[PDB]
Structure formats: C-alpha cells, structure tokens
Amino acid sequence: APAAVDWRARGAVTAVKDQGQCGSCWAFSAIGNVECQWFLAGHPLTNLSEQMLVSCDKTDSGCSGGLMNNAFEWIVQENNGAVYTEDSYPYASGEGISPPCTTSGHTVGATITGHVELPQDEAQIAAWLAVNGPVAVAVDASSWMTYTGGVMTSCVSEQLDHGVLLVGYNDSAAVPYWIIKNSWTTQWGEEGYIRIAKGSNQCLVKEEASSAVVG
Numbered sequence: 001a002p003a004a005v006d007w008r009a010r011g012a013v014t015a016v017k018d019q020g021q022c023g024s025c026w027a028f029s030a031i032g033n034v035e036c037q038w039f040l041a042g043h044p045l046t047n048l049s050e051q052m053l054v055s056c057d058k059t060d061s062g063c064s065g066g067l068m069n070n071a072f073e074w075i076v077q078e079n080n081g082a083v084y085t086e087d088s089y090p091y092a093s094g095e096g097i098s099p100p101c102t103t104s105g106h107t108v109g110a111t112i113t114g115h116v117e118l119p120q121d122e123a124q125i126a127a128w129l130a131v132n133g134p135v136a137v138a139v140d141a142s143s144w145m146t147y148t149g150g151v152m153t154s155c156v157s158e159q160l161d162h163g164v165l166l167v168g169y170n171d172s173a174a175v176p177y178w179i180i181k182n183s184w185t186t187q188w189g190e191e192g193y194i195r196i197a198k199g200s201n202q203c204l205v206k207e208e209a210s211s212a213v214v215g
C-alpha cells in the first residue's frame with residue numbers, strides 16, 4: 001500500500017457535521033461513507049441525508065442507535081438503492097427525537113448497489129482504503145471526551161459504541177496513525193477530526209469496518 005493517504009485533500013470528503021442530542025452516529029457514519037464512494041465513482045461531491053435513515057430506516061432505532069450494515073442493507077432492500085440529498089431531506093433530529101418518516105417530496109442524490117464488510121485487520125483495511133476510499137468503522141469513544149489534538153495514545157478499547165469514518169492513514173509518521181471524521185462539530189479535535197495510533201487496535205477500530213458499493 002502507499003505509505004500515506006489523505007482523502008480530505010483529494011475532493012472526496014464533505015464538511016464536518018453535528019449529530020446534536022440524537023444517538024444518530026450510525027447514520028452519520030453510513031452517509032459519510034456513501035458521499036465519498038459516490039464521488040470516487042466519478043459523480044459530483046454531493047451532500048446526502050442522514051435524516052432519511054434516522055426517520056425512515058425502521059431496521060435501526062432512530063435517536064436510540066443503529067448499525068451501519070443495517071443501514072446499507074435498508075437502502076438497497078427497502079429504498080431501491082436511493083440516498084436523498086441533504087437539501088431535499090434536511091437534518092431534523094438535533095433536539096434528540098426522530099420525527100415521522102416523509103415518503104415523498106425528496107430528490108435522489110446517490111444510489112448504491114450493496115456493501116462489503118472488511119477484514120478485522122488494520123493493514124488490510126488500509127490497503128482497501130488506499131484504492132477504494134473512506135471506510136465506515138465503529139469505535140469505543142469513551143476516551144474521546146478528553147481528546148484535544150495530536151495522535152492519541154492509550155485509547156480505552158473495551159466496547160464498541162460510536163460510528164465514524166476513516167478518511168486516511170500515515171505509516172511514515174513517528175507513530176503511524178489513522179485519520180477519522182467525527183460528528184461533534186469542527187470546534188472538537190483537529191477541526192472535527194481525530195488521529196489515533198495505527199497497528200494496536202486502538203479504540204477497537206479494526207472490529208466493524210465496512211463500505212457501500214457504488215456501481
């Protein structure tokens with residue numbers, strides 16, 4: 001694999017978001033992945049709708065939580081592969097509730113055909129990311145309320161609880177690291193990003209990695 005990859009500088013990653021008081025990290029992870037995969041398939045970089053998942057994907061639990069793989073499966077099996085634009089289905093859950101699903105009045109911004117579940121191996125995830133783009137992952141975020149910048153050390157790695165998006169890595173650095181997009185505003189971390197050490201399963205980052213497939 002290349003020594004380093006950073007998709008943020010290559011036109012593939014939209015702005016950092018704010019999930020607010022809702023337990024919707026799963027939806028930010030899944031949609032951020034779709035956004036990146038759609039661009040890398042040769043389509044314009046488009047802002048897509050987390051609200052579609054939070055209100056309409058009844059195989060997940062709204063502001064009480066969900067799974068990225070369930071969300072990818074719902075899009076294809078129940079929603080004809082469609083992912084609506086942000087502008088046509090804007091985020092409505094920042095106060096912490098999921099309003100009833102709206103089943104018309106939206107415009108499709110992207111489509112997917114399926115998803116892949118990646119190996120539980122950091123070198124294999126990096127190799128896939130270098131060619132095919134950003135990857136949805138789950139982490140233990142319990143230590144992330146202390147992060148202020150730099151490459152974090154000694155991440156608490158006990159229980160997966162938070163969905164996020166891998167956007168790059170650097171194996172040439174003094175301590176090799178992953179680059180991760182969070183959904184806690186740009187005032188948190190490094191303009192909304194976190195770097196964690198790579199190669200020691202920090203925060204359980206290798207355990208639940210997956211991606212949508214765009215045809």
Ligand SMILES: O=C(N[C@@H](Cc1ccccc1)C(=O)N[C@@H](Cc1ccccc1)C(=O)CO)OCc1ccccc1
Nearest residue numbers: 022023024025026060061065066067138160161162163
């Ligand atoms: O708890 C979750 N998911 C986790 C993420 C996850 C994804 C993949 C693997 C492990 C964890 C989840 O959604 N976490 C929630 C936790 C939360 C709840 C309420 C307020 C703020 C925060 C998040 O928003 C993560 O920030 O899913 C429960 C579930 C399972 C099946 C169907 C419906 C919900």
